[PDB]
């Protein structure tokens, strides 16, 4: 009974983990768009500079 | 009630096709075709005025303004309809 509760809390940990990491990676992508340095074509072409 | 954004005389929402060579490139290469519309137009009003007057499912409606004032509309039809067999009927 208690291990199933630990699996429900673990499932809450997986759902909230995927949501928080999704929000974090999208906000990193917005922080790199706002500086003007996000798209890896515009960085991979400017690897030499 | 279902209002549009603006009531804009729907039998005049399209003005003229474009007969440049790049338009024929869009026909043979894109299954799309080129119209000249007025500035007061939509991706919802032009898109309805193609599936009714022509009888063709239109895929997308890529619009742009042109600095002489008038508006240009690249309309891409569905895969089921060739734009070349529907453009020779009009006169392209």
């Amino acid at each position: 009974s208690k291990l199933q509760l630990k699996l429900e809390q673990k499932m809450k940990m997986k759902m909230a983990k995927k949501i928080r990491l999704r929000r974090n990676r999208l906000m990193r992508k917005r922080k790199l768009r706002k500086r003007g340095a996000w798209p890896p074509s515009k960085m991979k072409k400017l690897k030499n500079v | 009630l279902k209002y549009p954004r603006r009531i804009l005389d729907v039998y005049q929402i399209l003005q003229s096709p474009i007969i440049t060579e790049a338009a024929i490139k869009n026909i043979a290469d894109e299954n799309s075709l080129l119209f000249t519309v007025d500035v007061r137009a939509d991706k919802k009003m032009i898109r309805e005025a193609i599936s009714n007057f022509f009888g063709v499912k239109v895929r997308k409606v890529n619009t742009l303004i042109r600095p002489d004032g008038t508006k240009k509309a690249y309309i891409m039809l569905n895969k089921e309809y060739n734009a070349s067999e529907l453009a020779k009927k009009i006169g392209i």
Binding site: - | I65, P67, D68, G69
Partner: protein, 57 residues
């Protein structure tokens, strides 16, 4: 340093918030200015910008 040059690359939005038609019509004084512009015969009674598009030319 810079030079003794006055106008620069300020956005036309901020030039239209000051010298545009709205702050020119929000006062009795500015609409009296438009009495003098329309009374003289100027084709462009304000120097503005547009929130949608740039220029039809």
């Amino acid at each position: 340093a810079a030079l003794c040059l006055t106008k620069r690359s300020r956005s036309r939005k901020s030039l239209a918030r000051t010298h545009g038609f709205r702050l020119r019509m929000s006062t009795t004084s500015g609409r009296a200015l438009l009495k003098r512009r329309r009374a003289k015969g100027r084709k462009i009674l304000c120097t503005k910008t547009n929130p949608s598009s740039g220029k039809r030319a």
